[PDB]
Design a protein around this ligand. Structure first.
Ligand SMILES: [Zn+2]
Length: 29
């Protein structure tokens, strides 16, 4: 699939890993 992180320009053909990647992207403030 055509995945794309809204926080970075990097992309991953998989979505499972995108969960851990996008997770760290956000923080609890
Ligand atoms: Zn990202």
């Amino acid at each position: 699939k055509k995945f794309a992180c809204p926080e970075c320009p990097k992309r991953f053909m998989r979505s499972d890993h995108l969960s851990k990647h996008i997770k760290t992207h956000q923080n609890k403030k």
